[PDB]
Structure 1
C-alpha cells in the first residue's frame, strides 16, 4: 500500500523513513570483496605526517612547562567562544535590516540595533587586540620544541616499513607514544633548553634503537641500522 518492506533473513519488516546506518572498523584490512565495495563508500582515518608533528609538538609543550600549555589552551578556547558569539551577534543584522521592512525609523528596533552594533564593534576590536596579544606570546613559547618533533615524526615513518620484508614486524603507535613519554620521564636534564633539545633527541634515538632490536631477528639488525641511518640523516650520502 503506502509503505515499504525490506528483507532481513526470513522476516518481513517495515522500512522506516528515518533509517540511518553507520558502522566502524578496527583494521584496514579485513574485509571487502569487489561486490560490496561498489555500494559502500570507504573512509580511512589515518595518522599522517603534518598531524603527528603537531601532536608531538603539543606533547613537548605540555611536558616543558604546564603554564604555557594552560595559557595556549585558555586563549584558544576564549578566542573560539568569542568568534561564535561574534557570529551570533552579527546574526541579528538580517533582523535589523528586514525584520518587518516598515517603520524602521519609527520603532525602537533601530535603537536596539545601535546597541547591538556597538557590542559587535566592541567585541571586534577586543578580538583584534586579543589575536595580537596571543600570536608572539605563543610563538616564542611554542617554537622551542619543533626541531625535536620533526625528527620524532621522521622516526615513526622509518620504523613503519619494517613489516614488508618479514611479517610480525608490525609496530603500534600507542607503545610509541609510551616511549615518547619514557623519554621525558627518565631524562631529568637541567641545562640550557637549546642544549637540552639535542640531549633529548640523542637519548631518544638510543631508546628507539634498543626497543626495536629487542624484537628483530639476528640477520636483520644491519638492515635496520642502515635503513635507520638513511632515515635520520639523508644528507651525508649525496646523490646517485
Structure 2
C-alpha cells in the first residue's frame, strides 16, 4: 500500500518546509547540508578522491610541475576539512534546527486547521468546494507577494505579520464566494483556530463546549422564575449556565443586581454587559469576551450575532471583516492571483443577475468580452468555438446562465483541465446557485457569491 493522501500532519510538514525554505533560507540550507552529510557529502568526497587517483596515475608522480597534483590534493584537503567541520557540528546544527522548527510550528498547525476547516465546509453548503491547490495558492500569496513583508526583516515580527496576513487572506479569499449568514460562522471558526494558536491563553474548552451544546443539557427539574424580570425560559438558561463553574452564582448575582433589568431591556446590551462571571484572576480580553458571549447566550439571544462580531473583533483583530463591507473589487482578483486555468464561477442567488458586474469590469479594464448564452444548442457550439479561438488570442469569453446544462459544464471542466496557450485569457461562468452544477467545476474554479 502506497498512500499519497494528504492529511493534517502532511500539510503541517509541507507548510513547515515551505516556511523554513522562505523565511529562514540559511536554516533550510543547514537542513540540506545535514541530509547530504549522511548522503552526498561522503559521496562527492569519494568522487574527488577518485579524481585525485586518476590525476596521480596521469602525472606519474611528476616533480618538475608539482602544482598539477598539489592543487587537487589541497582541494581534497579543503573538502575533507569542510566535511570534518560539518560532522563535528552535527549536534549544534541539529539542535538549532529544532529550535527554529519549534518556532515555526504553530503556523503549520494553524495552516492545517484552516485548510481542513475549509475543506470540511462542504457540510454547510454545496457551493463551498475548495481544492488543496486553492489553499496552497493562498499560502504562496501570503509568503512571497505580501505587502506587509516588504520591509520587516527581524524574523520575529515577520512571523506575527505572516500569521495575521494568513488569517486575513484566507478569510478574504473564502468569504467572497460564501453566503453572508455564514461569514460570522467562518469568523468564529478562524477565531477559535487562532485562540488555539495563541500562547498564554487557556483553551476554554469547557466554555466553548457549553456555548455549543451544554445549554441543551437536561435541567427541567429546577426551573424557577427567579426575579419577575427574568422569564422562565431565561431562568432555565440561567440554570444551564449555572451548571458552568464560572457562572455558578448567577442567581444570587442577579438577585443582588438592581440594574440588571434595564440592561435586559437595552437596545444593544452587547455593547455594555454587566460583570457576572466570578473569577479571581482578571481574565484577558479573550476570556472576558467569551464569558460575555455565554452571558449573551443566556440573556437576550437576539444580540448573539452582535456579540459574536464583537468576539471576532477582539480575537482576530478589529475590522477583520471590514473587507467584506467594502464593495467587491474584482479587477485585482481577475487581473492577478487567478490562473487562466481557473474559471471565475459567477454564483448568484436566484432572482439576481451578475453579468453586469463583469461587463463593468471589462469596461474599467477596456477589454473585449465574447458574451454567449448557453440555452440553445447553437449556444453550446458557439461557446466551444469562442473558447477555441480565445485561447489562441486571450479574449475574455463570458458564458451566462450555464447551470441549465450540467453535462456541458462537466465537458468544460475536462477541457479546462487542459492547459491554455494564452495567459491573459479569462473565462467567466454566470450561473445560479443550483445543487446540480458540477462539483468538479466548483472545486476547479473561483466561486463568487452575489
Scaled to the shorter chain, the TM-score interval is 0.5 to 0.7
Does the alignment pair 1:151 with 2:110?
A: yes
User: Could you say if the C-alpha distance between residues 167 and 43 of structure 1 is closer, same or farther in structure 2, counting changes exceeding 3 Å?
Assistant: farther
Alpha-carbon deviation of 1:169? 1.0
Of 129, 133, 141, 1:174 maps to 133
User: Could you say if the C-alpha distance between residues 238 and 217 of structure 1 is closer, same or farther in structure 2, counting changes exceeding 3 Å?
Assistant: closer
* Structure 2, gaps ≥5 residues long: 44-83, 197-202, 211-450
* Structure 1 segment 89-128 matched on structure 2, within 5 A: none
Does the alignment pair 1:208 with 2:170?
A: yes
Q: Distance in 2 between matches of 1:74 and 1:192?
A: 24
TM-score by length of 1: 0.56
C-alpha contact (below 8 Å) 1:162/1:169 kept by paired residues = yes
User: Could you say if the C-alpha distance between residues 150 and 189 of structure 1 is closer, same or farther in structure 2, counting changes exceeding 3 Å?
Assistant: farther
User: Could you say if the C-alpha distance between residues 182 and 222 of structure 1 is closer, same or farther in structure 2, counting changes exceeding 3 Å?
Assistant: same
CA deviation vs aligned residue, 1:111-170 (integer Å, no higher than 9, x gap)? xxxxxxxxxxxxxx9997464353224234444322222212221122121111311311
Q: Distance in 2 between matches of 1:147 and 1:189?
A: 23
Q: 128-137 vs 163-172, which deviates more?
A: 128-137
Alpha-carbon deviation of 1:45? 2.7
* Structure 1 segment 1-240 matched on structure 2, within 5 A: 45-81=4-40, 129=88, 131-132=90-91, 134-184=93-143, 185-186=145-146, 187-190=149-152, 192-233=154-195, 235-236=203-204, 237-240=207-210
CA deviation vs aligned residue, 1:67-123 (integer Å, no higher than 9, x gap)? 322231132023145799xxxxxxxxxxxxxxxxxxxxxxxxxxxxxxxxxxxxxxx
Alpha-carbon deviation of 1:66? 2.5
Q: 129-138 vs 205-214, which deviates more?
A: 129-138
* Structure 1, gaps ≥5 residues long: 1-41, 85-124
Aligned to 1:31: none
Q: Distance in 2 between matches of 1:46 and 1:232?
A: 26
User: Could you say if the C-alpha distance between residues 144 and 220 of structure 1 is closer, same or farther in structure 2, counting changes exceeding 3 Å?
Assistant: closer
C-alpha contact (below 8 Å) 1:61/1:68 kept by paired residues = yes
CA deviation vs aligned residue, 1:35-86 (integer Å, no higher than 9, x gap)? xxxxxxx8753211222111111111111133322231132023145799xx
C-alpha contact (below 8 Å) 1:213/1:221 kept by paired residues = yes
C-alpha contact (below 8 Å) 2:12/2:108 kept by paired residues = yes
CA deviation vs aligned residue, 1:184-239 (integer Å, no higher than 9, x gap)? 22232415322222221111111110100111123322232233333432524454
C-alpha contact (below 8 Å) 2:19/2:104 kept by paired residues = yes
Q: Distance in 1 between matches of 2:27 and 2:188?
A: 39
Q: Distance in 2 between matches of 1:182 and 1:126?
A: 38
Aligned residue pairs: how many?
160
TM-score by length of 2: 0.32
C-alpha contact (below 8 Å) 2:119/2:130 kept by paired residues = yes
Alpha-carbon deviation of 1:175? 2.0
C-alpha contact (below 8 Å) 1:53/1:150 kept by paired residues = yes
Q: Distance in 1 between matches of 2:186 and 2:106?
A: 24
Task: Give the match's secondary structure for 2:127.
Answer: coil
Task: Give the match's secondary structure for 1:233.
Answer: helix
